[PDB]
Amino acid sequence: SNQAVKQRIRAIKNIGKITKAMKMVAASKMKNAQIAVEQSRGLVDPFVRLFGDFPAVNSNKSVVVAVTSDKGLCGGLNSNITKYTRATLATTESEGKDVVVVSIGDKGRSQLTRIESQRYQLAIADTYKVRVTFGQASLIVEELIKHNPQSYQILFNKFRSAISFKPTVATILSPDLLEKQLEDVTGNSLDAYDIEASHERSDVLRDLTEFHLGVTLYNAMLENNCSEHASRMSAMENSTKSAGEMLGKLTLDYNRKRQATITTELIEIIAGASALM
Amino acid sequence: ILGMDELSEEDKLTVARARKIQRFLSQPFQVAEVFTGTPGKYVDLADTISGFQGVLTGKYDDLPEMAFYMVGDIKEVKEKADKMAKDIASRKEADNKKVSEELK
Amino acid sequence: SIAELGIYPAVDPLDSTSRMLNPNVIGAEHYNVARGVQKVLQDYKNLQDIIAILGMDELSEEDKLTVARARKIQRFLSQPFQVAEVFTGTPGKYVDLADTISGF
Amino acid sequence: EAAAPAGPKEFTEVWNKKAPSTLIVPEFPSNYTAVKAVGEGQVHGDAFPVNFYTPHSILSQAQKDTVVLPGVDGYFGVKASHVPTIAQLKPGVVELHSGAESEKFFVSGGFAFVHPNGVTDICVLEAATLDQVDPAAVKSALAAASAAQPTDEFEQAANRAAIELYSALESAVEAKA
Amino acid sequence: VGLSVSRVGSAAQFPGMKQVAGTLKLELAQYREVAAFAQFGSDLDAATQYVLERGARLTEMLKQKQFAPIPIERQTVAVYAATKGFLDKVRVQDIVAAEEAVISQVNPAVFKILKANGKITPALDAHLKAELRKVKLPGA
Amino acid sequence: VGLSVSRVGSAAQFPGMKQVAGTLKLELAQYREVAAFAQFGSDLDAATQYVLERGARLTEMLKQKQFAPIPIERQTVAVYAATKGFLDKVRVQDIVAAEEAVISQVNPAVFKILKANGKITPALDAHLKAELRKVKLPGA
Amino acid sequence: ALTGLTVAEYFRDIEGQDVLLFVDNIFRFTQANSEVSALLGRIPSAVGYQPTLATDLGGLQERITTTTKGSITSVQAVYVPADDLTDPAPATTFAHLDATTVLSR
What we know:
This is part of a larger assembly, with 1 copy of chain A, 3 copies of chain B, 1 copy of chain D and 2 copies of chain E. Chain A is an alpha/beta fold. Chain A has helices spanning 2-31, 44-51, 77-89, 106-109, 134-145, 175-179, 201-274; strands at 61-67, 98-104, 120-124, 151-159, 165-173, 194-195. Chain A has 2 domains: 1-24 and 236-277, Helix Hairpins (Orthogonal Bundle); 25-235, no CATH class. A 5-stranded mixed β-sheet of chain A has the order 3-2-1-4-5, with helices on both faces. In chain A, 47% of the residues are buried. Chain B is an all-alpha fold. Chain B has a single domain, classed as Bovine Mitochondrial F1-atpase, Atp Synthase Beta Chain, Chain D, domain 3 (Bovine Mitochondrial F1-ATPase, ATP Synthase Beta Chain, Chain D, domain3, Orthogonal Bundle). Chain B has 4 helices and no strands. Chain B has helices at 9-25, 33-36, 45-57, 74-87. Chain B is extended, with a radius of gyration of 19 Å. Chain D has 2 domains: 37-133, no CATH class; 134-173, no CATH class. Chain D contains 3 helices and 12 strands. In chain D, α2 (137-145) runs antiparallel to α3. The longest helix of chain D is centred in the last third of the chain and has 21 residues, at 153-173. The radius of gyration of chain D is 21 Å and the shape is globular. The termini of chain D are far apart. Chains in contact: A-B, A-C, A-D, A-F, A-G, B-E, C-F. At the A-D interface, α2, α3, β5, β6 and α7 of A face α1 and β7 of D. β6 of chain A pairs parallel with β7 of chain D. Chain C: ATP 1 binds at residues 18-19, 22. Chain C: This is ATP synthase subunit beta. Chain C: Produces ATP from ADP in the presence of a proton gradient across the membrane. Chain C: It is found in: Mitochondrion inner membrane. Chain C: ATP 3 binds at residues 19, 22.
């Protein structure tokens, strides 16, 4: 029973160096993937200063995406997104609107089914294995365009810094299925612009909203990956703290057992010798 | 080490239920009320069996953890769970209209 | 630990030593394969504390090859004994020295 | 016709009724942009802000005085207080000028907006500087692109985009200044 | 406080201190609960922030200096001024000067009434709620 | 190396070996601090990966082969060839062959100077440094 | 250590000085008194030490004090046996210590 404690110290110390490695790994991945996150942050801005921000609009059909992580030591990031999924998905509910829920990342596949199982249709996963590219987000936008709602919702975590990732819902409306219908006030605000397309405005907005979905989906799953790495860096920071305080308790209790072992073996030896002399 | 964020949903369910049945095993004693101040409860055996069966099957997952702490039986869990919830609002309006001004 | 895996004879490969393990006694083709088998079984044990936690998701396509080759080595140290036909099921195997040198 | 006037502010107000109250409001893409379209200003004479973007880069964000954009009708130019425009670009050379010096980015196509406040947002996928293209592989690929001509209008439309992009790349690489 | 205990001296202590200190034991209990939940500060309920601020006020109240013991009425009034309001203006640092300002600026008749009566009578509770409002707190 | 000390220390070291062992033990201390993270190879750090790669070089330097003890000038020439960087090219698993590729290919007139003078003077440092680039190491 | 104490106590009590005594490894003093207690056939106390460990240590350390004449200030090197501060030899020594100066690498 004195060797159960020594091997438990062995287990806690190897766990405490594993988590300290994974903290530095997450910190290394957070800096060389922030060099790709705030590069892609720019292209979201022309579409929001062109189309605006219409989250609570009365869509007939809506596809909501919660883009989450694939690996699992992120520390309550994906669960916070799973709760903001229903927190923003009940604020849409005004007339019995249809909703399709879709998860990007393996840890959203397991977590939305507990709350919304009949409204689940697609799981995109293995997305951060090599990297995130725009052709990939384009294909995910294509399969979100196969069924064609009137609105899109993307739920992710905006990578502010290595401390805060306050989560974000970004909204993308189908071209004149609801978007220009949300633009017409005493005329319209979209009619200021000269459409310089080949075909009509109804097709330049058709192309323009697929490009907006691809840009928003790319930036969402890039910001979510960088916030995942910083959340894992903050999660394995508390794991080495816990595996150090548990190690210190176990080291103190081992010192007690070591002292008691020497005392009890000594008392046995003295009692053996005193029964002869 | 890894927190409750790494657990399964089955594991999160058994951790929540086990915390509730850990708090529910505690009980105020009639001989402890002279130094705890909480009056003690004698819980009958039928009430013990029925209450712990209900917390096992998942009939009382609506209730928080601290509603089970230091109560007699499962009627008092629901009473304390209404009372903790009801208070969550009532924290003020001891501002004026006192019995402790100078000429009361 | 080797016996609970089912590797029989449960000989600890790292902990078993001999004075016949010098290259000027048993040759270099025997000595270097024995030391290489021991090195692969040792850095597998250094990886094994992270396989049991993470699960072969990062392992660099050479340490994954280390884990695979060492699992093949760990199975290949096992051998059905001619006196253990009563125990499990198997007829026993006599392996010559050159055969196991060539195999490992 | 616009009976659901949403926004960050309306979603903040309605979201405090159906979500639990301890949850802070989810952020919106509006909260990280100080520049809008209807917010007048940002002009200051001759130079205008050119937000030349890319999915994997930001190629320019400083103010320039004239931008040559390769729209689908043809090459056009943007001076300071230009008319509002949503221009789809064919594969061509976006010329950024600050004076006598010109940087020539050959882009892949993708839209370019001019807003009422004079901000211009060029938004293309692959936006290479024309320095880093070789003049050999373009006709080398267009010789094959002029060969595989199937009845598959998916593949034929890809061939049309191929020969048109490659032809524009050729006509932009022989015509250097 | 979670491990210290005195069961024979309980319900045999100063009656005014017994009227005040049950709220103090309960508030330090909830402070221990929410410090047992959040040993790192990032998730703030703003009611958990309230019990954190009240617990940090009270554990600054109870800590004192060496070789200077306090009479029990000046401890009763000092923890009366803390388990109630009267100190939330003071932030977390100036509480050691705040309680000294409270002991100094309170009219010293109420200490004689609290010592002689044994507990805070409702007249004394009225004068004590009154006297803890004309006190110049150093956190302002 | 972390637990083996000498309370006499480097006052009784071969000079010349003292020139190179003093930075060898610092490099091995840095490697031991960043050790057991070499299983994270796909998870690269680009500042600790250098000291991890060089620590894996140097632990392969100090291996020996059983009743072939080495004279001290050959030892400090090997620690020079591994410490200063002349074996940064070679792969980590054939440094035991790259060591006698240094000992047998550097001409043995260097060993007489380093033994007789008992230190690496710059007059010998330049010649040994030139002699350490013309070695035909098993590398690619 | 008592011989060094006597040399220091002469400077304190006759010369009237502020003496410095350096007991190099007070743990070796403890270990030596433990050996002479084991050799005189006494039953060892906790972990393995002499039964008189606190008094054999306090007999040395209580002569290091300030008198009205002068003082003795003692700088004693302390070895901690198994990196265990709850071992009875450093736990008995640390009752007597008035300061630690930890020298770090």
